[PDB]
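Hi V.,

Quick status before I head out on leave. The structure for the redesign project is tokenized and pasted below; the design run finished overnight.
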């Protein structure tokens, strides 16, 4: 039986939210089989829970933000979600005492590290995977995103920035997803902002926690960060990280192929919901033979 995974230990990190700029403590706790991924605002009385569900994602392109009927929020969950997806975590309580997940270094790597420190516990219940049986595609203008059948998890992401700082040959990345390949190739890729966009968002009271320590900053002509990039193609890798985290809002690892061009948080969420809404396009599956399981998590 391929088993559900949670943490062995409670772990904690403190940081600041990228957009709120608020100091926040993140606490991640083990949880029982069939619990799922739950996010909690613990600064409110009573505390407020959110599930990992595509429908709890706020209507915005800025980030992936959880919101409830009362407009209580947990902003910027995409990078932490990518780490959870990457290590195949099924059950976990994620607590924050402020309206945003800390940005840390802008990548998913700090979350990978914390999850590894917390240890992985395999539980006595079958891990369910969401397996694609048909192809589903969504579009927004020139943007598009697709999920199709594939025995594993393949991602193919293309960006098209027409920016002097981002060479044309570095704008596509393809990945056969495993915990190993995610951690090694994707997890360290940092978020980025263009100055034009940063100014726009700053003007609107956003990016309050933005800094060179948490983001690649690109001006009109070049990356401004002194020591450059972690990868020559760090930008497209980060867009892939975002997609991994966004798709994980359903709380299951997917078996299929994700292919996308300029897809951001809104379109990734649109795709997820479009898949879920077409019953014929997917199914939940479980496995018994470890030696042939489609996805490898360590
Ligand atoms: C695009 C996707 O990658 C997405 N990211 C974002 O949209 C996103 C990222 C970062 C930021 C930022 C920032 C920022 C950095 C540094 C400074 C301080 N400097 C002072 C001197 O002048 C230069 C500025 C102020 C602000 C804004 C927006 C994401 O990854 N979503 O998941
Ligand atoms: Zn991101």
């Amino acid at each position: 039986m391929i088993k559900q995974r949670t943490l062995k230990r409670i772990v904690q990190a403190t940081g600041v939210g990228l957009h709120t700029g608020k100091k926040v403590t993140l606490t991640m706790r083990p949880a029982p089989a069939n619990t799922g991924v739950i996010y909690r605002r613990t600064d409110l009385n009573p505390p407020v829970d959110f599930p990992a569900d595509a429908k709890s994602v706020r209507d915005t392109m800025l980030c992936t933000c959880l919101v409830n009927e009362h407009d209580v929020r947990i902003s910027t969950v995409e990078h932490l979600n990518a780490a959870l997806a990457g290590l195949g975590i099924d059950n976990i309580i994620i607590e924050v005492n402020a309206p945003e997940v800390p940005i840390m270094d802008g990548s998913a790597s700090p979350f990978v590290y914390l999850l590894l420190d917390a240890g992985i516990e395999e539980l006595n219940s079958a891990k369910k995977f969401l397996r694609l049986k048909e192809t589903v595609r969504v579009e927004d203008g020139d943007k598009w995103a697709e999920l199709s059948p594939f025995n594993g998890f393949r991602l193919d992401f293309t960006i098209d920035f027409n920016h002097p700082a981002i060479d044309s040959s570095t704008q596509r990345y393809r990945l056969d997803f495993s915990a190993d390949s995610f951690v090694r190739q994707i997890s360290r890729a940092r978020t980025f902002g263009f100055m034009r966009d940063i100014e726009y968002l700053q003007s609107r009271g956003l990016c309050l926690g933005g800094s060179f320590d948490c983001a690649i900053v690109v001006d009109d002509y070049r990356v401004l960060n002194e020591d450059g990039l972690r990868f020559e193609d760090e930008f497209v890798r980060h867009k892939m990280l975002d997609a991994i985290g966004d798709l994980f809002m359903c709380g299951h690892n997917i078996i299929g192929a994700f292919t996308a061009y300029k897809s951001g948080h809104a379109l990734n969420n649109k795709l997820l919901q479009a898949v879920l809404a077409k019953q014929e396009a997917w199914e939940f599956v479980t496995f018994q033979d470890e030696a042939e399981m489609p996805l490898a998590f360590k």
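Above is the designed sequence. Residues 158 and 172 are 4 Å apart (CA to CA).

G. will cover questions while I'm gone.

Best,
W.
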